[PDB]
Amino acid sequence: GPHMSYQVLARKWRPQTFADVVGQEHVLTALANGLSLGRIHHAYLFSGTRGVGKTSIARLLAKGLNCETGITATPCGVCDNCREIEQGRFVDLIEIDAASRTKVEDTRDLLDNVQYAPARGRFKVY
Amino acid sequence: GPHMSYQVLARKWRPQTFADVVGQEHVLTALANGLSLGRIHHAYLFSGTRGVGKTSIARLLAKGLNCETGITATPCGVCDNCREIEQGRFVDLIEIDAASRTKVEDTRDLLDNVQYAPARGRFKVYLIDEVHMLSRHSFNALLKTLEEPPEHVKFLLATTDPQKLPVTILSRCLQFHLKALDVEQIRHQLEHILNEEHIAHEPRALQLLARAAEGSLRDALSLTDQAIASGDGQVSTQAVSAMLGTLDDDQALSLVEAMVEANGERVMALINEAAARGIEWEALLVEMLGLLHRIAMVQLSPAALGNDMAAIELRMRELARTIPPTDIQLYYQTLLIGRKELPYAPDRRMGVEMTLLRALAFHPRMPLPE
Amino acid sequence: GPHMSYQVLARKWRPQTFADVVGQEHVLTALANGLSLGRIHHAYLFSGTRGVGKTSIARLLAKGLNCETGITATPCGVCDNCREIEQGRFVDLIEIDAASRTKVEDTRDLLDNVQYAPARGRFKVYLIDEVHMLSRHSFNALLKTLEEPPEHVKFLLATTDPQKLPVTILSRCLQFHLKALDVEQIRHQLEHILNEEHIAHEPRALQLLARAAEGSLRDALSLTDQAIASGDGQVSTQAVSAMLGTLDDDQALSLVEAMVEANGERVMALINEAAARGIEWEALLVEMLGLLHRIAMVQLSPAALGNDMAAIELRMRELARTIPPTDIQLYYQTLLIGRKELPYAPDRRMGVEMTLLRALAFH
Amino acid sequence: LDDWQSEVEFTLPQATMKRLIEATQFSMAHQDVRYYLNGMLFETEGEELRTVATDGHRLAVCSMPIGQSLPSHSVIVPRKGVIELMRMLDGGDNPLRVQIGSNNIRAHVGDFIFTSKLVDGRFPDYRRVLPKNPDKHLEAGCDLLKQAFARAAILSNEKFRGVRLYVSENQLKITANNPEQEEAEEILDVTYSGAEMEIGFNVSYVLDVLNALKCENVRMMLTDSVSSVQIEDAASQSAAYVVMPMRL
Amino acid sequence: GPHMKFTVEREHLLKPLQQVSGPLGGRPTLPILGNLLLQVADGTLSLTGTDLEMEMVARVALVQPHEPGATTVPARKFFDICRGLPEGAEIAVQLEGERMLVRSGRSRFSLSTLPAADFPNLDDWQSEVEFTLPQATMKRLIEATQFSMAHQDVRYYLNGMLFETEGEELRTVATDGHRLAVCSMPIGQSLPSHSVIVPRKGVIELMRMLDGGDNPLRVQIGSNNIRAHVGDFIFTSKLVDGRFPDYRRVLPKNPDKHLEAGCDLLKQAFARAAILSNEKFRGVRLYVSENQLKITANNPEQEEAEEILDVTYSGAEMEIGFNVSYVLDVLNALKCENVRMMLTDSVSSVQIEDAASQSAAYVVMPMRL
Amino acid sequence: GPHMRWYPWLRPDFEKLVASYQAGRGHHALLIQALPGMGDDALIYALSRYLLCQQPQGHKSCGHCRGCQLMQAGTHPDYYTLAPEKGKNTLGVDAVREVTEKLNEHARLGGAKVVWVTDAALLTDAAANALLKTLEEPPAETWFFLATREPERLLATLRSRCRLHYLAPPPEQYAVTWLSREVTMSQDALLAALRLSAGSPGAALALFQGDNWQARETLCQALAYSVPSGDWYSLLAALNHEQAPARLHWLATLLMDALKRHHGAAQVTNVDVPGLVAELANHLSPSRLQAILGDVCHIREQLMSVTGINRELLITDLLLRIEHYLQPGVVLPVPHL
């Protein structure tokens, strides 16, 4: 009946595991082996069509790149580092919606941030 | 000469009691059921052709929600907030010209002011009329509030074409559709209104205006006020017809019957006496085309003729029995072409006369001898 | 002094009272009765072809509506408000050319304006002309102010063609279809004007000018100015005939009789001669169409001869006798489609040559 | 190029011209549809120079004697011309030789030369705009009114800053509401000898009029809850103002 | 809810609101950043202005029975109403639940309220150094160090001032391109060694609010939070991290040429040379000879400026280009009539100290003209 | 070019068109209809020079004054030109808007206030309706001018305000004589140039001094191989030079001359290629010839009207359709509707 009224399916079913991501295995395998081997690039861009997984894969990459277990291709999803992102509040993760932020002042504000070390994670994710 | 009268029947006789909304039984039934049972959705989308009552129904529901308390099914007596709603004094009733807020920043501004509920009322209602012209980013912006808004804010969106706006918004809460009013209901409304204003009315004029109104009471009322202006506070058949400009459909009927009967002299007589009547040749051609489509229509079902056509239904039946479909289509093609090149004819009368004479010369049975 | 005291007839003889308007009794009567009886609508949409009077009827309506002597169907014309509205310097009659003010900035400006009080007249009226090309955003923003305005706001819409209006915009305003002016009305108004201005004329040239301008009095006056600019400030049959380049029935009938008998060489020589004299080709085609129409009439009933001129009606009678109705219909259709395609033809003369040579197809 | 002869010649103190322009400048139209509004009317008659500005919702008339016999003349100077005229003349130098021709205006101020072209057309008359039978009158100190309206304008609507005046024998009241459903209300002690009346103004024009009025005591004249107001110096008649009210 | 009551005189209310206006408004990204926080503590009202990195608190003394509580109100509208009211009229302020009622004289106003949206701990310092720097000390220090610091610079740490407390003295340093400033103020207190970087905007806010050369001030400086108690009021700012160059490595560069003499004469000469200085390469040439200085400028306008000054010198003939603006700021902030100038090389930093005392020193890296 | 070029046969018309302004009865508007390169531009320029000149000499402009000295420098403050920018082709609402908003101010030099639209057909209909008010009721001492190859394509309203003055092309012999004095070659080429250009001597000059003439020759030679062999496709390279309208017009003129040769007519346009005309008549059937001519004209219209259409695809389809039609057993189209 009132199912999902608490948590819309989109929000409720945000993939916290790579096995929870149906499709995009071509990208999932690449990300997993890149994390395990260490071929991590300074920047990653994903292209998709609305509800394709871009935020999901980006947040999963944030979990796997700064988990308490280390840089792991299989995040636990239960550690403090993982649960901080899962709830939504991670200090070293800065999620930005560019639709409402097209100005240069705020972009420069984040530009200043690019320099300091991460507060809790291993790397700063923008 | 001078005065303080008039109220513009359009601006006067809008429903404000749920008893003046003519037709649209589906939406009124749904709204009454929802209000009485207390189930109210967060977004309302009234669609339909122009001049039907979507804005009036929106005002109806908005004042039915906030009217000196009481969850009524619209009837609300001595309701202050309702009387300011019908008086143009906004009371938690925010009409928005969506064309002035197409950009996503404007709709974001619309979003951030959603918390201002307690303003001499319980619900604040938003009327984003012509909602199909919002930008995609604005659609997305308002979608977040669409799925889970505050309890006290109700969205009521009005649009003409639901096809244009995105599917997700279409599906969100509800989509009601108002059909075009039949000419019979238009007749009733015009008769009732002109009765209310102690003004006489000939039923022929009422039927003429009802058919001339494309199923929209606002068209019907504009035309009816034009008819009242053309006369002197009285609507009459000849004044109404001279206002529309439509000739005697019996004159056109005699003309097409003569064309069928292949008597060119009678055709010339009819066309010149119609010229003396000061009627538009384009109008003559389009009325003859309407009659030709009607005589093709009766070939498939007797019910083709409307109620008014009871005057000339017998001649329709006789022509339908007499003339085979191929000849009807030949005449229709000839006259449709003739209308297509009417603007390029040396004179409108010249072109119409030539088109009729051509339909005579290319007569399937008895053409003009060489 | 040197400020050009002269004004063009197309504007000097603009209507100034409801008794000065040529024709359109079907709308003048309605407007005057609405003014008198006390029924005035807040949005009027006058629609019609060029040069039939939408702006003039609207301006007369404005003159009447905010006259200080009550609200009468007959503006006094001597007061202030009448004088400024006639001059167009009145604050409360605002002229908006919808081609310019179509961006949302200008529409928002207008909607801001409508909320205030008037300045000098009873009613502040927006004469929006060429409304049929407001951008969709402008119309959707204008819906509210066109539907339920304040007490002292009335709108006067002028459009060249109702088709481009969003139909919802049509439905909220009061439509007035200004009929195209009949040739008799145009010729009588021209006679009255030219007699008034002490200008010599003759009725024949008036009929030619009325025929040339397809039901547009402003067009009639434009052609009048063209006809008086050339020909020592007078209107004469030779002057208007040269100005239009029109041709007598003899030459057009020579063309149709050569083409109906498949005399291609004669047809092309006639076209060459016509080009040498430099006629207007559309005029040639309309004359051919008229002759074919008359031939068809004669074929139908012998009573309707060619008697308006009846100079070479022997040829018309013979051609009708000797040609089946079908062939004349084909000739008319061919010439007519060709006439439709003159602008698309690379040249006017060659377009007429195409049309005639195609008419030469039948044997 | 040969210079244009002038049909209107006079000379003005800088104080007089500055006062006139400050009195009427905020009262002229910007890019308004009516072309003859986007400017300032400089009427001259007898020994008096009069200045008129309007935008369809406002009217500033400022009359100052000159002492020089002058013909009855009218002229409109557009937005840019008068703005850079006010910019041009600022010092205390007496020379203000103003020349009005048929198509252009030139004011000589010492070593600086003013130049602009007049807006062709005839301005509407202001006397037809000022109400002719003001049957309600009010009086108050200028600074009290100005400070009151500035204070009440804080929480009004943004784009159009509407305020409501309730004028009665007991006192004067002004209120303001905004899209944020915020209320502001305040009271002033003006001397009135009439009944209750409700009118709706825009605080922007009222505040501008009060700011540029520059007097001690001010008198308001009123006729109806829709007709025009006539605000004037309670101690002089050299400047009058009108604010066509607002529909609610 | 709790409700609040105030009867606060306008004049004693304006200065706090006017002061805290720094971290208020200015394109508020959130409905909570552009608003001021009021709270009642015993017999004081705290006004908090926040912009997520600078928190300014003003303590209005309460003299009347005032209902306790806290709220958030639009800062700009509150400031405007408190300023426009007649002088000396006590304002009566009440919390009408979701609304904020404020009355004065014959005027009434209502405000929209936010219950609790900016109430975290808001601050946490380390306080390595807690010097009671008196007013006049940091007054001259900051006016002599601010200059025109880094704008758009990639080196973030160069934006904020470097504070280093050692022994009895605090040295304040600032690097920006060519220019560099330092002041060694003798606090006189036995103080621990500490090094810190403060944001430039925080510095300008502190200097602007500072004023009033009489009261000793409490400065608590940590590694991420700095607090300054300017008499009645409190300010707090974040702290920029390290990577700053050492002033002990940029100030002492073994100067070998020494010069002296008037500072205001140099100011006039520099201003007159700036007229004909290179408009694209801001800076003029300085010819240095024994007990003589010559200043020359050649702008693209083909105008040559030359002046001669009596500046003591016992070194070798030299030709050093320099930015006129940087050195003019040096002279203006030196607040002295005579200065000392040490030259090293045409591509090595040039020092300029106060001839009055060693307390003020500066560096300008020379120009190549 | 520099002040364009006066044309000798234009002198009568101007005289008439200045009389209406000497008497002061001049209609403010004027819609000059004249063929491209006919010389209407010089007429409008000379008119405006007479109008804005402070001292109008009898049938001349000034002789000596500043009022038209600023005209010669092309910097008069009243004289406005409305032409699309060199990088564009449609005259926007913005330029007409600026001109009409600056018209309401008085005349700077105390004279007239003359406007000019360089080419009216290029006016976007929105610009036409923005200029409608200015044309119908201009302020005092305001005049206008316009130039059109044809008036019928203009908006129904804009011409209704204006007088439709016409520039008759000079008599055939006079035009031939003038062109012979200017350009030297065989009279067959000159007659082809005049008849192709509908009588515009300036357009004949543009054809000669322009490369197209040689390209025209090329086309003839190409057809000299195509029609005897039924191989039209090889015409592609000849008909693609961004001049597809003009080249298709030349092809249609040739086909017109062939159809004329069937119904033997004394005069035909192409007189430099009589052998080509005879061959075209010989190989091609009259019904096929008329269908092909109709297709040629249709394709030329499609190319001229819609910009951004692909020329190569259109011409290739045209040539393939023609090749198909030359095959026996095909059904040819007929114009209708």
Ligand SMILES: Nc1ncnc2c1ncn2[C@@H]1O[C@H](COP(=O)(O)OP(=O)(O)O)[C@@H](O)[C@H]1O
């Ligand atoms: N590849 C995917 N596998 C599983 N769920 C998905 C996938 N793509 C989208 N989703 C669903 O949609 C929701 C939002 O996905 P998201 O990745 O944020 O889309 P976007 O690309 O537009 O940012 C997720 O919570 C998830 O439920």
Ligand SMILES: Nc1ncnc2c1ncn2[C@@H]1O[C@H](COP(=O)(O)OP(=O)(O)O)[C@@H](O)[C@H]1O
């Ligand atoms: N169902 C209806 N019942 C009564 N009056 C109606 C109805 N529909 C239209 N009208 C008349 O038309 C006028 C305007 O109707 P409106 O609701 O604006 O139509 P629209 O759907 O096109 O906006 C009303 O004032 C009313 O008189």
Ligand SMILES: Nc1ncnc2c1ncn2[C@@H]1O[C@H](COP(=O)(O)OP(=O)(O)O)[C@@H](O)[C@H]1O
């Ligand atoms: N009904 C009419 N009666 C008299 N003159 C007319 C009429 N209609 C048009 N005219 C003439 O046409 C000129 C322009 O008329 P106008 O009313 O502007 O037409 P429009 O509807 O196209 O704006 C007028 O100056 C007048 O001379």
Ligand code: BEF
């Ligand atoms: F819709 Be997604 F988050 F781009």
Ligand code: BEF
């Ligand atoms: F809103 Be309706 F189309 F008049």
Ligand code: BEF
């Ligand atoms: F020329 Be009109 F206004 F159609």
Ligand SMILES: [Mg+2]
């Ligand atoms: Mg996303």
Ligand SMILES: [Mg+2]
């Ligand atoms: Mg509606």
Ligand SMILES: [Mg+2]
């Ligand atoms: Mg008009």
Ligand SMILES: [Zn+2]
């Ligand atoms: Zn984890």
Ligand SMILES: [Zn+2]
């Ligand atoms: Zn109710």
Ligand SMILES: [Zn+2]
């Ligand atoms: Zn009057």
Ligand SMILES: [Zn+2]
């Ligand atoms: Zn000259």
